Design an enzyme around this catalytic site. Sequence first.
Site, PDB file in Angstrom:
ATOM      1  N   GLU A  95       0.689  -1.448  -0.223  1.00  0.00           N
ATOM      2  CA  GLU A  95      -0.051  -0.066  -0.121  1.00  0.00           C
ATOM      3  C   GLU A  95       0.917   1.236  -0.005  1.00  0.00           C
ATOM      4  O   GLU A  95       0.536   2.014  -0.817  1.00  0.00           O
ATOM      5  CB  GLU A  95      -1.073   0.108   1.324  1.00  0.00           C
ATOM      6  CG  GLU A  95      -1.925   1.221   1.208  1.00  0.00           C
ATOM      7  CD  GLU A  95      -2.745   1.468   2.415  1.00  0.00           C
ATOM      8  OE1 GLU A  95      -1.880   1.507   3.505  1.00  0.00           O
ATOM      9  OE2 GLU A  95      -3.909   1.718   2.396  1.00  0.00           O
TER      10      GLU A  95
ATOM     11  N   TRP B 192      -8.279  -2.418  -0.240  1.00  0.00           N
ATOM     12  CA  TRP B 192      -8.977  -1.392  -1.122  1.00  0.00           C
ATOM     13  C   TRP B 192      -9.941  -1.981  -2.028  1.00  0.00           C
ATOM     14  O   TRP B 192     -10.948  -0.889  -2.555  1.00  0.00           O
ATOM     15  CB  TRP B 192      -7.756  -0.640  -1.609  1.00  0.00           C
ATOM     16  CG  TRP B 192      -7.513   0.553  -1.077  1.00  0.00           C
ATOM     17  CD1 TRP B 192      -5.880   0.383  -0.293  1.00  0.00           C
ATOM     18  CD2 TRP B 192      -7.954   1.691  -0.638  1.00  0.00           C
ATOM     19  NE1 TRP B 192      -5.830   1.653   0.475  1.00  0.00           N
ATOM     20  CE2 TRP B 192      -6.875   2.471   0.079  1.00  0.00           C
ATOM     21  CE3 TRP B 192      -8.985   2.358  -0.895  1.00  0.00           C
ATOM     22  CZ2 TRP B 192      -7.104   3.508   1.001  1.00  0.00           C
ATOM     23  CZ3 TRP B 192      -9.067   3.625  -0.398  1.00  0.00           C
ATOM     24  CH2 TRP B 192      -8.219   4.253   0.583  1.00  0.00           C
TER      25      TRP B 192
ATOM     26  N   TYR C 274      -5.071   9.304  -1.736  1.00  0.00           N
ATOM     27  CA  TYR C 274      -3.877   9.541  -1.086  1.00  0.00           C
ATOM     28  C   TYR C 274      -2.504   9.795  -2.092  1.00  0.00           C
ATOM     29  O   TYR C 274      -1.980  11.115  -2.244  1.00  0.00           O
ATOM     30  CB  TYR C 274      -3.370   8.355  -0.275  1.00  0.00           C
ATOM     31  CG  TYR C 274      -4.572   8.396   0.895  1.00  0.00           C
ATOM     32  CD1 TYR C 274      -4.480   9.306   1.924  1.00  0.00           C
ATOM     33  CD2 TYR C 274      -5.334   7.066   1.004  1.00  0.00           C
ATOM     34  CE1 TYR C 274      -5.178   8.893   3.213  1.00  0.00           C
ATOM     35  CE2 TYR C 274      -6.251   6.985   2.136  1.00  0.00           C
ATOM     36  CZ  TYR C 274      -6.095   7.986   3.243  1.00  0.00           C
ATOM     37  OH  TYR C 274      -6.969   7.909   4.232  1.00  0.00           O
TER      38      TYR C 274
ATOM     39  N   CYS D 230      -8.210  10.008   5.401  1.00  0.00           N
ATOM     40  CA  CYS D 230      -7.974  10.034   6.991  1.00  0.00           C
ATOM     41  C   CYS D 230      -6.575  10.316   7.571  1.00  0.00           C
ATOM     42  O   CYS D 230      -6.510  11.223   8.408  1.00  0.00           O
ATOM     43  CB  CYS D 230      -8.819   8.873   7.556  1.00  0.00           C
ATOM     44  SG  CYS D 230      -8.144   7.315   7.357  1.00  0.00           S
TER      45      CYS D 230
ATOM     46  N   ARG E 270      -7.436  12.423  11.168  1.00  0.00           N
ATOM     47  CA  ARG E 270      -8.573  13.209  11.446  1.00  0.00           C
ATOM     48  C   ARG E 270      -9.472  11.963  12.084  1.00  0.00           C
ATOM     49  O   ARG E 270     -10.565  12.269  12.795  1.00  0.00           O
ATOM     50  CB  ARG E 270      -9.488  13.559  10.469  1.00  0.00           C
ATOM     51  CG  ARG E 270      -9.662  12.845   9.246  1.00  0.00           C
ATOM     52  CD  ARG E 270     -10.809  13.470   8.538  1.00  0.00           C
ATOM     53  NE  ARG E 270     -11.299  12.626   7.267  1.00  0.00           N
ATOM     54  CZ  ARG E 270     -11.730  11.531   7.452  1.00  0.00           C
ATOM     55  NH1 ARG E 270     -12.812  11.491   8.462  1.00  0.00           N
ATOM     56  NH2 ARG E 270     -12.251  10.748   6.544  1.00  0.00           N
TER      57      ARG E 270
ATOM     58  N   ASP F 151      -9.101   4.592  13.446  1.00  0.00           N
ATOM     59  CA  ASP F 151      -9.833   3.355  13.778  1.00  0.00           C
ATOM     60  C   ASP F 151      -8.652   2.579  14.671  1.00  0.00           C
ATOM     61  O   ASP F 151      -7.812   1.888  14.104  1.00  0.00           O
ATOM     62  CB  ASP F 151     -10.076   2.267  12.618  1.00  0.00           C
ATOM     63  CG  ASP F 151     -10.919   0.901  12.924  1.00  0.00           C
ATOM     64  OD1 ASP F 151     -10.879   0.647  14.507  1.00  0.00           O
ATOM     65  OD2 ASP F 151     -10.913   0.165  12.109  1.00  0.00           O
TER      66      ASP F 151
END
Lengths: 294, 280
Positions: free
Chosen positions: B62, B84, B110, B170, B190, B193
Amino acid sequence: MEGEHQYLNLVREILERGVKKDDRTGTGTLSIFGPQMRFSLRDDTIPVLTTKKIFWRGVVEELLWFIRGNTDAKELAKKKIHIWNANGSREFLDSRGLYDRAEGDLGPVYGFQWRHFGAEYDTCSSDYTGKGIDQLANILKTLRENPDDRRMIMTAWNPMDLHLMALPPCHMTAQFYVANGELSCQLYQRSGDVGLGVPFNIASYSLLTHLMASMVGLKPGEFILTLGDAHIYNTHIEVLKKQLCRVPRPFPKLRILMAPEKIEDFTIDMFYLEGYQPHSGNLQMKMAVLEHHH
Amino acid sequence: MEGEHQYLNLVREILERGVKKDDRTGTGTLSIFGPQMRFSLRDDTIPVLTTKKIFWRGVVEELLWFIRGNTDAKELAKKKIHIWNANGSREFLDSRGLYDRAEGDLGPVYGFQWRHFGAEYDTCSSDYTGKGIDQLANILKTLRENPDDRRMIMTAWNPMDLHLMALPPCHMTAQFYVANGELSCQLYQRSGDVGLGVPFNIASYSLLTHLMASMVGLKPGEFILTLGDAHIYNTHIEVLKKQLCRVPRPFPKLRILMAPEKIEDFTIDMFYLEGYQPHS
């Protein structure tokens, strides 16, 4: 330790463990990276430092000027707020290649981003009604309709616009959050002058959070200031060591008399500080004169 | 505290004092706002959690995908990285109003922001060479030339493009900093998890920092993770209380065999973990 002690502890950390670095001009700093301070806004508290006098009227008029989405230093100068004048001067704009910019025209700095993100900038006096993304309006609505949202982000960091600005924004991104009827704010500040700009940022964003809570039927909760490059100029060290000797008094309370329908219609007459009792430093100066003699 | 203890303490804090909130779908969380963790990258250390096994290969594939500026979930799926695939599905893209978007085309998420900020998005297979602001390339150059710079910011939070993205980012904004020849990174996340995404982000941005240091002749310093909404889903709670009973082991070391001339040409074969010993 709570309240003002979060600020004083940050000052001490930088004085004692900061690294000896240099800024843009090659002027000396002590520096650390990533420190955080947290302030309660409960029981109407607003974290305006008591260990030195903050220019409250400047905090308010700057913030309302942001909220309106204005970018003309000359409008602040008319209210006898001069803190933006140097950045809007002919010399400063010229040094940034902004030769075609009228004196005082800062470009698309903070306020313009807050209300008009992504709009094309013309001058500081053009009419930007319904232009760009109104980040602040969007957050207020989301706070009323869906306060659990995890995307309530307001940014001034637009890489396309940075070259149009007098200076790139440092209080650059804020996030809002709601729990138990309380509105909290976290600010990401990439570069903080801990001796001068940071106390101002704490008062400014804390005020913004009390004002936003007004607009949306919530109570104020916390203000969190997270810094990138947190620094102290070498020229401020001695003054900041004497400031650390001063015992904080309780923070003032903010009293809001009303909130208008639209947040850009707040005036300084609609709220005030109650019980602001900052040090003058006279007792400390007297004890220095007396102690020296022994 | 030490690194992994900061992650376990954050979990304790949310379980103990978190607020009962809900997410997008109305599925339960415990939540706090504004916590921070700090991880040393000195002595080659890389904070891959030892109290459960992290999917390290998924971390690396990733990240490299981000660094190339790629946005096709199907390229990850081809390497059997499927994290994804759900956000690229016909069903998920339709729920976002992206009815014209080929399956797996995530939009300008991103990596497209890191390497092409402000460029017009066409598809995930279009050629974006020399398009938009190469934030990552700019920072590497600033690191070599002017490492005291206070504007080494990389953001994926582009308000103009959020509606084009499978999800708003995020892990949204990073800043780099140098002192004493050491490179540090602070991530603003922001929405974390804490049970699943956050251990990943720590491994990912810590690896990014090690790799960037490689490219510019600096040593790795620290990674600081700053959260906004830091939350534990209700369904992760029992498994996280068991993870808190496990004593951490010292973090692995990252070995880098070589650095390529350009950062987007790193492959997984060019570095590995040494002495990774996670609990099963």
